[PDB]
Design a protein around this nucleic acid. Structure first.
Ligand code: MG
Ligand code: MG
Ligand code: MG
Ligand code: MG
Ligand code: MG
Ligand code: MG
Ligand code: MG
Ligand code: MG
Ligand code: MG
Ligand code: MG
Ligand code: MG
Ligand code: MG
Ligand code: MG
Ligand code: MG
Ligand code: MG
Ligand code: MG
Ligand code: MG
Ligand code: MG
Ligand code: MG
Ligand code: MG
Ligand code: MG
Ligand code: MG
Ligand code: ZN
Lengths: 83, 104, 208, 99
RNA sequence: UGGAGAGUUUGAUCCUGGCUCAGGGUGAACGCUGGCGGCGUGCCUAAGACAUGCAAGUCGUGCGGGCCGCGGGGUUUUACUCCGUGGUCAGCGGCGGACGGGUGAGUAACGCGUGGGUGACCUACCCGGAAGAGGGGGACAACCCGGGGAAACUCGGGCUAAUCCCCCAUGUGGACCCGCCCCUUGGGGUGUGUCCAAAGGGCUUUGCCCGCUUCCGGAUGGGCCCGCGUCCCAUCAGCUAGUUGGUGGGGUAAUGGCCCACCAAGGCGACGACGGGUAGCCGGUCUGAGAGGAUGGCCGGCCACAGGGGCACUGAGACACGGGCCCCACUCCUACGGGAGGCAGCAGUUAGGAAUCUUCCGCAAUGGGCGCAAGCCUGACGGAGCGACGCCGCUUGGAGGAAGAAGCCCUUCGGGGUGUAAACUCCUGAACCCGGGACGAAACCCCCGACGAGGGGACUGACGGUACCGGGGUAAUAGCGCCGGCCAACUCCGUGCCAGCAGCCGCGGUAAUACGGAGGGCGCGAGCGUUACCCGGAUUCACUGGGCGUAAAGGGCGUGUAGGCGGCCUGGGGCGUCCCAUGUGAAAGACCACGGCUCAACCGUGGGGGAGCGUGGGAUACGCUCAGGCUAGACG
């Protein structure tokens, strides 16, 4: 089941995730189908979260199932905001 | 695209199958001289149609037998043993170099 | 860590005079003042014609012993100037001249390079506010290099910034003796520095 | 010891027996049908064909035969039977055979 | 944006030539020495053997029970029995257990790489669309009774639930045979015939949630096939009978000799078959001016394996590391009949070895399985631990301070050196004490709102009282190699071809800058040196870029097969070759830019480059090909 989750790319005590689209069975840091964003849990830079919402929306358009956190970050960048 | 190839039918001895001798050419990776290498494919010819000496186009196909993944797509130019020759003779030399030797 | 040990012996071995002490190195005492010869039991014996190696080795030892730096660091700094565009000889000097401990020294905050190092280490320095105690910190254009407010009362910092009254400063610098500040305007160029060094040699030495 | 998921083996076994039985009926009836048709028995040769067809499609209900495996069987069966009947056949019941 | 050479064959010389060194690198190890921190890394041998703990479970919102307890009922009491409810245990059923983690034994192969093919295929869960869920029957555990066994465990009999299994119905539809049409390998449409569906559960219970069935489509993941690439030996030259092809059949999701019967006699090979050896392959990595050489640990991708061999079962998926059977070996239990095991999972033990760590903390974060959810499991993971194993950062102080203490070394005995070094003065103030104390964590959930969008609320950190901040505050580790030349650094003494050094040339037989110590010096510095291996130097396997009269090197000569190479003019083709566009060339790494941690190491973001191959379009000088012509080669 393809998903939209985070992939650990930081470094010790310096986490930096990559909001990715990957089959559900791969190592969390394994080969992903497509990157679609990143996330700096510690906001160590003005820009600490981006999400190709155009893309997200697409994957969700096809069974992409986001981690609870992955969904959080997404939402937080009007990924679902249907105003 | 299903790879399409060209060659001479050097073998006609089988039923519904022909041996196409596809010649390849390319530069040697380290010495660069262009070198002519080659290989035999057993093309599928259901109607017997193609006879020894023809030049046919071979086309990548669904397996037909072990060691046989090509079908004769079409005839390029009929008859010309001048090519079958090279082949046959080359083989004939083999029939020597080992313990005795092959006539020049 | 850094050399640490009799320093004027280097002054002597290198022939050229190196200012690894600030004061005194001006007084008739840098020893290069009546004793411009190398240390040890052979200092005064005739010198045999140095080998191509010797020359390059010495030239490097010189430049490096100036900024008082570990060959390790020195080398990597070099290899860096090497990759970067621009005449390597220059780029390299520009980089050595960008070490925080160097600037603190080039700004009269400190009497010598060693001392400036310690000031940086004991946190008596500022870099656009935030204090930085990494003597090998790369000071870059625009960076203001202050002095610890807390330290601004320190006799040493006072005496130093005092005599600094009057003294001009490098054209790639500029210091406000009042608030004990100074700005790193631009990477000094080869012409800007007057080091008793032939960097064409230092380059050649790492050629081998 | 005792990785309670022994249960899986436990179950696997039952299923095996279940499947194993399902297929025997299939084969049996299939021959039953082919053999008939062979010796031209039309009417009844098809009657049995149908039951067979059914059992097969049924196996594909669950994970017994499932998929094309079922499809194959059906065609290979109908082929054999329809052909075999060409021995003066005249498919009466027309059973599963399309007129 | 890029390339250094030196020593050594002679009395001397030039050339040839081998050897040797300086450099870079290492999952290292060994020696002397060793202070702090960050990141990273750590069985390279016995794919040897393993104690103990842990490492995959989860659903009571699919079903029925056993046991222990409580409360309330039908009971006048008693017996019996009904309901609710707590605890606990497995059973049935479902999903997961095919991922994640390990290792590299085997494999020279469609294994891997790259680019394609699939009208020859599959894909649980997820997403979109269409339609549906009507009725009936049954069994087996649990439980109960009996039997066998030392045990592991087993056999028989009886009861029962379900989303367990079966039958009939509905046929949206789909499946098969046949016909027809369009398509072109088995793609798609259509007509008759036959065949095939379903299961329930929960409630804030006339609706909403979870779930079930059939079909189509998507998304992801995968099978299979094909072109090209992929080490050494020809002191391996011929290999082959399911072997090569065919017809029919089995088999699978699917093509296929994959398997089988029958038929044919084929298939492969010097462009190196067969055989032997060695080896997982790749992105990369190391070195190099490059070409190239070497390599494939850590990280990511693929493959293979799970004590050795074979086999299937269940399943969407396995031939299934912590599932099954059999054989072998080994180990343990055995009442000797017979049983139980498999750390190449984390940690740990033992053995082997020059050599490789904690039986740690945590589930808080990320990710994974189950669950409506709360939540449970997670040695995956996030962290801490030990080891200078690597990289980067940092300290052992700073300034002053004699024509220059003492000691030690040398002396031409005048003096020279260690050396501003020390002593000493003053300044700062690692360690260390005190106080404050973190980002990483906002979701899931709850409430308003429709369980949507949107808004509010609550819970939650191992690391850790660590990072960091502020106050106080001590001058507070330095070692190792080398000094004949290559090669930076010279003297005295001791020894006397001895003891010893040694990478090569060499040094030592009483004036040794070459041994041993000392003084002094050169180089690096919490490291320094050694050994081992790879690239370099080595244009010393020479494509870039080597040579063969006498240095190593022309075959004893010819005739000639394959192969390599091919005069002048013109035309067609456009295979090579050149160009353009386009797809691919994953991430990581490399390069550039900016950014985050006081810097850097490390890390984040963005950008550019990239051979090779696929597709389309173009060019035609050269090479190829075909055709025509020619006489300058050749032949007559
Ligand atoms: Mg000589
Ligand atoms: Mg030589
Ligand atoms: Mg082999
Ligand atoms: Mg019974
Ligand atoms: Mg219909
Ligand atoms: Mg039915
Ligand atoms: Mg091996
Ligand atoms: Mg080279
Ligand atoms: Mg099955
Ligand atoms: Mg195990
Ligand atoms: Mg967790
Ligand atoms: Mg989780
Ligand atoms: Mg010298
Ligand atoms: Mg002597
Ligand atoms: Mg070479
Ligand atoms: Mg050459
Ligand atoms: Mg030569
Ligand atoms: Mg000779
Ligand atoms: Mg001759
Ligand atoms: Mg020509
Ligand atoms: Mg072309
Ligand atoms: Mg920065
Ligand atoms: Zn001086």
């Amino acid at each position: 089941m393809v998903k939209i989750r985070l992939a650990r790319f930081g470094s010790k005590h310096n986490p930096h995730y990559r909001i990715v689209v990957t089959d559900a069975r791969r190592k969390r840091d394994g080969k992903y189908i497509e990157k679609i964003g990143y996330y700096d849990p510690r906001k160590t830079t003005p820009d600490w979260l981006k999400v190709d919402v155009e893309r997200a929306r697409y994957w969700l358009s096809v069974g992409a199932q986001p981690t609870d956190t992955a969904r959080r970050l997404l939402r937080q960048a009007g990924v679902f905001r249907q105003e | 695209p299903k790879k399409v190839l060209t060659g001479v039918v050097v073998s006609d001895k089988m039923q519904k199958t022909v041996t196409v001798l596809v010649e390849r050419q390319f530069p040697h990776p380290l010495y660069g001289k262009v070198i002519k290498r080659s290989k035999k494919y057993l093309a599928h010819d259901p109607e017997e149609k193609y006879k020894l000496g023809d030049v046919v186009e071979i086309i990548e196909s669904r397996p037909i037998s072990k060691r046989k993944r090509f079908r004769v797509l079409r005839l390029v130019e009929s008859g010309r043993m001048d090519l079958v020759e090279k082949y046959l003779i080359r083989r004939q030399n083999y029939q020597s170099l080992s313990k005795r030797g092959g006539k020049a | 860590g850094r050399y640490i040990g009799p320093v004027c012996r280097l002054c002597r071995r290198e022939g050229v005079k190196l200012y690894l002490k600030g004061e005194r190195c001006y007084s008739p005492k840098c020893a290069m003042e009546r004793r411009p010869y190398p240390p040890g039991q052979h200092g005064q014996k005739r010198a045999r014609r140095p080998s191509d190696y010797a020359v390059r080795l010495r030239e490097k030892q010189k430049l490096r012993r100036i900024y008082g730096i570990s060959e390790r660091q020195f080398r990597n700094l070099f290899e860096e100037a090497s990759k970067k565009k621009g005449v390597t000889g220059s780029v390299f000097l520009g980089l050595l001249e960008s070490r925080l401990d160097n600037v603190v020294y080039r700004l009269g905050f400190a009497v010598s390079r060693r001392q400036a190092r310690q000031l940086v280490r004991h946190g008596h320095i500022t870099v656009n506010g935030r204090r930085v105690d990494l003597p090998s910190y790369r000071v870059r254009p625009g960076d203001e290099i202050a002095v610890a407010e807390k330290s601004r009362n320190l006799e040493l910092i006072r005496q130093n910034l005092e005599a600094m009254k009057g003294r001009k400063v490098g054209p790639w610098l500029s210091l406000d003796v009042e608030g004990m500040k100074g700005k790193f305007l631009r990477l000094p160029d080869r012409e800007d520095l007057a080091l008793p060094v032939q960097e064409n040699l230092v380059i050649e030495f790492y050629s081998r | 010891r005792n990785l309670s998921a022994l249960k899986r083996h436990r179950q696997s076994l039952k299923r095996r027996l279940r499947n194993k039985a399902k297929k025997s009926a299939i084969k049996t009836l299939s021959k039953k049908a082919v053999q008939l048709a062979q010796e031209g028995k039309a009417e009844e040769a098809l009657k049995i064909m149908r039951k067979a067809e059914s059992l097969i499609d049924k196996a594909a209900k669950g994970s017994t035969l499932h998929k094309n495996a079922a499809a194959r069987r059906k065609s290979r069966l109908m082929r054999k039977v329809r052909q075999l009947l060409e021995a003066a056949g005249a498919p009466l019941i027309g059973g599963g055979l399309s007129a």
